Paper text:
[name] self-assemblage caused by mutations in the TTR gene leads to variant [name] (ATTRv) amyloidosis. Using cryo-electron microscopy, we determined the structures of cardiac fibrils extracted from three [name] amyloidosis patients carrying the ATTRv-[name] mutation, associated with a consistent clinical phenotype. The four structures determined in this study vary in the assembly of this gate, and we classify them as the closed gate, the open gate, the absent gate, and the broken gate folds.
Upon 3D classification of curvy fibrils extracted from ATTRv-[name] patient 1, we obtained five classes that could be visually grouped into two distinct folds. This population of fibrils has a crossover distance of 689 Å, a twist of –1.26 and, and rise of 4.81 Å. The built model resembles the structure of the fibrils extracted from the hearts of an ATTRwt patient and an ATTRv-V30M patient, previously determined. In this structure, the N- and C-terminal segments encompass residues from Pro 11 to Lys 35 and Gly 57 to Asn 124, respectively. In the exterior of this channel, residues from Glu 63 to Ile/Ser 84 are forming close interfaces with other parts of the structure, and residues from Leu 58 to Glu 62 are exposed to the outside of the structure closing the channel, and hence acting as the channel gate. Based on the structural arrangement of this gate, we classified this structure as the closed gate fold. We also observe that all three heterozygous ATTRv-[name] patients present with fibrils adopting a closed gate fold, in addition to their unique folds.
Author numbering:
A (entry chain E), B (entry chain C), C (entry chain A), D (entry chain B), E (entry chain D): 11 to 35, 57 to 124
Amino acid sequence: PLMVKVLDAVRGSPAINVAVHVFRKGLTTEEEFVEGIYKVEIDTKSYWKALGSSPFHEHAEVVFTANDSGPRRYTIAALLSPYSYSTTAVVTN
Amino acid sequence: PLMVKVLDAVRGSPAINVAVHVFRKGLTTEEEFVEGIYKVEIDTKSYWKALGSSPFHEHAEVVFTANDSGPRRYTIAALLSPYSYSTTAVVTN
Amino acid sequence: PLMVKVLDAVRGSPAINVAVHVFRKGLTTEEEFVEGIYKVEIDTKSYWKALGSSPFHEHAEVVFTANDSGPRRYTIAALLSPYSYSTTAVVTN
Amino acid sequence: PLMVKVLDAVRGSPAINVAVHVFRKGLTTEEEFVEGIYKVEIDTKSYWKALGSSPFHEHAEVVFTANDSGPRRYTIAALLSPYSYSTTAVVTN
Amino acid sequence: PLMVKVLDAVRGSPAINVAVHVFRKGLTTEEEFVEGIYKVEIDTKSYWKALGSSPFHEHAEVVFTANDSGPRRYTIAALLSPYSYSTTAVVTN
């Protein structure tokens, strides 16, 4: 008899992230999974994923150049950071 | 007898993200999955995903150039960050 | 006997994101899935996804150039961030 | 006997996003899925998706240039962020 | 016996987004799906989707240029953000 209690009585003003998972019983194969319940991808890159069956098989002259550059600013305050009775400020003068 | 209790009694003014998942019983194969319940992708890039069966098979002269640059600003306050009785401010003077 | 209780009694003024999922029992194959219940894609890019069967098969002279640049500003306050009795402000002077 | 209770008694003035999903039992194949219940796509781009069977098969001289640039501003306050008794303001002087 | 209760008793002045889904039992194939119940696409672009069977098959001289630029402003307050007893203002001086 599964019997799960999470955050039953709450009095006040909290700041909560709740993730409750209850369970009971080709190139990429995925089966019966849970992914990225609270997932953050800010600057994620991916080149040439799962190209396929028999690419560039017989003859190929490939020039792969990946120039990642340039002025990029990522200013984040309280990433996945619940708060209460606090002061969060981003000041970019 | 599955019996799940989440946040039964709530008195006050909380700030909550609730994700409750209850369960009971080619190139890319995906089967019976839950993905990205709370997912954030700010600057996500992907070149040449799942091109297909037999690409560039016999002969190919490929020049792949991925120039990622340029002034990009991402200013975020309280990303996936519930708050209560707080002060969140983005000030870009 | 599945029996799920979420946020039964709520007194006050909360700020809640609720996602409850209850369950009981080619190139891309997807089957029996739940995706992106609370999903945010701000700046998402994708070039050449699922091109098809036998592309550029015999002979191909391909020049792939992906120049991503330029002044882009993304100012976000309280992304997926419920709040109560708070002060959220974006001030861009 | 599935028996689900969500937010039964609510007294006050909350701000709620509710997503309840109850269940009981080619190039892209999708089957029996739920997607994007609360999905936000602000600046999403996609070039050359699902081109088809046998494209550019015999001979092809392709010049693919994707110049993404230009002054673009996305100012958002309270994205997927329910609030109560708060003050949300976007001030662009 | 499926038996679902959502937001039975509501006293006060809430601000609610409710999405309840109850269930019981070529190039792109889609079957038995629910999509975009609360979906927002602000600036979404798509070039060359599902071109067809055998395009540019024998010989093709293709010049694909996608110049995305220009001054574009997207100012949004309370996107998918129900609120109560609050003050939402967009001030663009």
